[PDB]
């Protein structure tokens with residue numbers, strides 16, 4: 001009900017189907033996406049294409065099931081080509097970064113608005129981001145909610161190519177003709193670059209402090225009222 | 235004496251004021267910067283802009299006439315420790331060349347807004363010196379490992395243009411631009427910023443020298459080549475290196 | 479017999495001279511390179527230029543003591559890694575497979591306009607050592623490394639310059655003039671910086687799952703299918719076993 005699944009050649013296309021909420025991840029969508037990734041190998045598919053219906057790839061969230069989704073993607077023997085058709089924001093950016101490769105629409109952008117919201121990310125989100133946009137641009141994205149445009153994303157390697165869903169499927173079909181064991185090996189080693197990192201004690205303290213703070217409430221109220229937030233640092 | 239401090243909106247601008255030596259660091263200047271970083275939170279500032287007076291951001295280290303030159307490297311370590319530990323984001327307004335200790339200082343900032351005119355350089359290979367591990371790892375994270383090799387192995391200058399390319403510069407801009415950005419950042423959720431800063435700084439750049447590193451670090455600093463480079467500059471002639 | 483060694487100023491130029499096979503590595507070529515790197519400091523040189531004769535820098539591994547060859551190759555990298563001399567790779571053409579590994583083991587790279595770099599391992603069903611993957615990642619950026627490794631995509635010289643894999647675009651002559659400058663720098667500064675830069679964590683032992691997948695790749699029928707398909711000029715039909 002929340003995703004579409006089709007297969008052409010040896011490519012499985014999984015489409016996020018909550019366009020009315022710009023494909024925000026809820027429970028049912030996260031669960032169905034998990035099952036789809038897990039069952040992806042059951043037929044004859046050798047590559048996956050992951051994309052969103054409508055104008056957004058994924059506008060955010062709407063932690064346990066979510067963590068299991070990332071685990072399923074990280075553990076999958078098949079390469080996932082993200083056809084990032086539009087904005088990938090927050091949990092949506094996380095999802096885009098968990099893809100093995102990325103084909104990005106010219107109007108798509110990437111963003112962690114966490115500093116606007118008073119929240120804090122897990123270490124993997126931060127490390128994978130630094131690896132993909134470079135540490136310097138990661139600092140700006142993390143510390144000041146900077147948007148990463150399709151064009152800058154191509155410049156840094158966050159986007160592998162700029163193009164359409166059709167382009168992503170053409171590339172996925174090529175990839176599906178390559179040697180699956182070579183692909184599996186390279187995927188495992190690359191994912192084990194150290195991005196998958198347990199929070200240090202001081203990170204967890206700061207994480208819990210941010211999440212449990214009064215500023216989280218102030219950010220929601222100001223955004224809901226479309227007015228500038230008066231944060232307190234508590 | 236050697237630094238200026240103003241506050242506007244919620245931005246604390248700290249200005250290195252030793253323009254006669256192109257803002258080159260020594261004992262006193264480093265001490266006064268440390269204090270200013272540490273005190274920066276007392277009022278209601280939520281961001282720091284760090285910049286230099288005149289044509290230079292910081293051209294390195296001088297130490298001649300410095301009564302406590304011996305304590306310089308330790309006080310410099312303390313400055314870096316204070317910037318790392320500071321809850322506020324530091325926006326480096328790199329108004330001009332950042333060389334040696336100045337590039338280190340620029341890299342310790344959280345964000346960088348760079349003058350079209352500025353460049354970054356580690357001239358260590360010209361002087362026979364060796365860098366701490368952090369300097370090498372933070373540079374690699376900022377310019378990419380490939381460019382970091384050319385910078386360290388051949389004293390390659392990094393222009394503002396290429397700095398923007400790689401991410402070393404987040405923006406090419408003036409002090410004014412840096413300050414407007416800092417004003418925006420000072421309006422974001424301080425506790426989110428605190429978390430991200432700590433995680434980002436804990437990427438592993440802060441790394442203890444391995445035993446072979448320390449061995450090579452001491453051979454370089456202890457070498458006659460270091461003396462030769464200083465003499466050569468002073469005599470305005472190419473240095474004749476010996477590898478000892 | 480299989481390398482050329484010349485010295486001008488304080489720059490030793492080592493030339494891979496097997497152009498008929500696009501400078502592909504075999505035991506004798508690896509052994510002679512190893513010796514040339516090891517003894518490069520015996521005279522008065524303080525910088526090394528490494529380059530290929532003809533159109534290619536190094537197209538890969540040949541073999542056609544070939545069971546005593548992966549060991550010899552590891553030794554070449556060790557000697558390059560341990561060398562006090564900075565090695566400027568003049569990448570005069572394609573660097574592929576073991577050629578790409580060799581190019582990355584260089585301290586700096588000056589790359590010809592028509593040169594490209596490539597790991598075609600996913601086309602052949604093979605798996606790389608961890609270092610090849612980590613060092614590639616550091617040089618082209620994690621994103622591009624993913625495309626190169628999961629899809630065998632080539633990296634052109636212009637993109638190499640963009641990422642830092644190429645420090646400059648230029649000729650062998652450019653690389654030699656650059657090396658002559660570096661040879662006038664302080665050797666102990668260079669030695670330290672090289673050691674730390676190489677000790678970035680790229681020299682990584684394979685994790686358990688890395689080794690499992692690596693052995694499974696190298697022992698698979700798919701390696702065979704890849705070869706037979708090339709010899710039959712036809713699409714491979716891999717089985718994932």
Ligand SMILES: CCc1ccc([C@H]2C[C@@H](C(F)(F)F)n3ncc(C(=O)NCc4ccc(F)cn4)c3N2)cc1
Nearest residue numbers: 063066067070071074094122124196199203204207
């Ligand atoms: C194996 C591949 C893999 C599996 C999971 C992740 C991320 C995904 C991200 C999600 F997408 F789910 F949002 N995510 N969100 C929260 C967490 C998380 O790890 N929480 C524990 C924690 C406690 C305290 C603290 F301070 C920091 N972290 C987490 N892991 C990345 C890669």
Ligand SMILES: CCc1ccc([C@H]2C[C@@H](C(F)(F)F)n3ncc(C(=O)NCc4ccc(F)cn4)c3N2)cc1
Nearest residue numbers: 310311314315318338366367368440443447448451
């Ligand atoms: C936590 C935040 C933080 C604190 C300090 C640093 C750097 C700054 C740099 C300076 F800017 F000061 F120059 N710097 N310079 C020298 C050292 C240093 O630590 N020396 C001990 C040592 C001995 C032998 C060896 F081989 C290498 N290192 C050192 N630390 C970076 C981050």
Ligand SMILES: CCc1ccc([C@H]2C[C@@H](C(F)(F)F)n3ncc(C(=O)NCc4ccc(F)cn4)c3N2)cc1
Nearest residue numbers: 551552555556559579607608609681684688689692
């Ligand atoms: C100190 C500087 C240094 C020395 C050697 C290397 C690489 C070079 C590369 C070559 F260019 F030779 F091909 N190479 N090839 C194979 C191996 C290797 O170490 N294999 C063991 C292994 C076990 C399990 C597994 F899963 C993968 N590999 C290996 N090491 C890198 C840096």
